[PDB]
Design a binder for this molecule. Structure first.
Ligand SMILES: *C(=O)[C@@H]([C@@H]1NC(C(=O)O)=C(S[C@@H]2CN[C@H](C(=O)N(C)C)C2)[C@@H]1C)[C@@H](C)O
Length: 245
């Protein structure tokens, strides 16, 4: 409580400065939105959601019975970009591994028509998915702002999205990435590689010991030959600098 806001700002900026990237982390305490980082103006610019869209993809899928919690999506046995994707998995493992081929399977089962209306219903980002049901979150035209992303995380953390409570829980249980100091961090990472320049995301929330939920959204530029870890390390440093974890 004794650290100056000036100091918080400078430390969080330096986290981004030390990664030699440009980015912003938005944090929501209650209804108050706070913007940090070394590139504050990214806050209301639009980027592709990339794998962040998996969270909505899973909500849509599960709500409309295109899959279940336990269903095993079989690997077709073709080569994948990463060897860890060359196995059979649930939605939940696909979420942790960011296995897009699974989420494309789920997008295909949902179908363009049902995807468009469901993404209009949820009012996610710019809400346009175009005509290609299997890559619209990767190369456009679906885009969203860091502010919009943290508000979606807030919505999801609090069960406010227009989906069943069981659906929202099922997807939330897939999102645990770290336990720290009796705080749980639930989030989804994102690395849009099919856009110039590349966008990195880590969107989610901290659930504190006491019970309050603190949504955040990190968003930065990835320069190829940069580690995906940086998204986590910057987020964790920021949340700890602000005493959120
Ligand atoms: C989603 O944005 C894309 C995938 N998302 C991520 C990510 O968010 O980190 C990756 S990276 C992939 C997942 N874990 C692998 C890894 O770190 N090891 C090989 C150990 C790499 C994808 C680019 C999705 C749309 O492709």
């Amino acid at each position: 409580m004794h650290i100056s806001s000036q100091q918080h700002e400078k430390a969080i900026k330096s986290y981004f400065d030390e990664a030699q990237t440009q980015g912003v982390i938005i944090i929501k305490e209650g209804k108050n939105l706070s913007t940090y980082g070394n590139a504050l103006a990214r806050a209301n610019k639009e980027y592709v959601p990339a794998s962040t869209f998996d969270m909505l993809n899973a909500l849509i899928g599960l709500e409309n019975h295109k899959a279940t919690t336990n269903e095993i999506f079989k690997w077709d046995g073709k080569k994948r970009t990463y060897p860890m994707w060359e196995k059979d998995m649930t939605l939940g493992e696909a979420m942790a591994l960011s296995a897009v081929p699974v989420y494309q399977e789920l997008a295909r089962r949902t179908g363009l028509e049902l995807m468009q209306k469901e993404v209009k219903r949820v009012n996610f980002g710019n809400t346009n998915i175009g005509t290609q049901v299997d890559n619209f979150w990767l190369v456009g035209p679906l885009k969203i702002t860091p502010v919009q992303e943290v508000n979606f995380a807030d919505d999801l953390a609090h069960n406010r999205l227009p989906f069943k409570l069981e659906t929202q829980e099922e997807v939330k249980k897939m999102l645990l990435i770290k336990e720290v100091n009796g705080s749980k961090i639930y989030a989804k990472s994102g690395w849009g590689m099919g856009v110039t320049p590349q966008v990195g995301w880590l969107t989610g929330w901290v659930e504190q010991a006491n019970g309050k939920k603190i949504p955040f959204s990190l968003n930065l530029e990835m320069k190829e030959g940069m580690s995906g870890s940086i998204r986590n390390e910057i987020t964790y440093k920021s949340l700890e600098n602000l005493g959120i974890i």
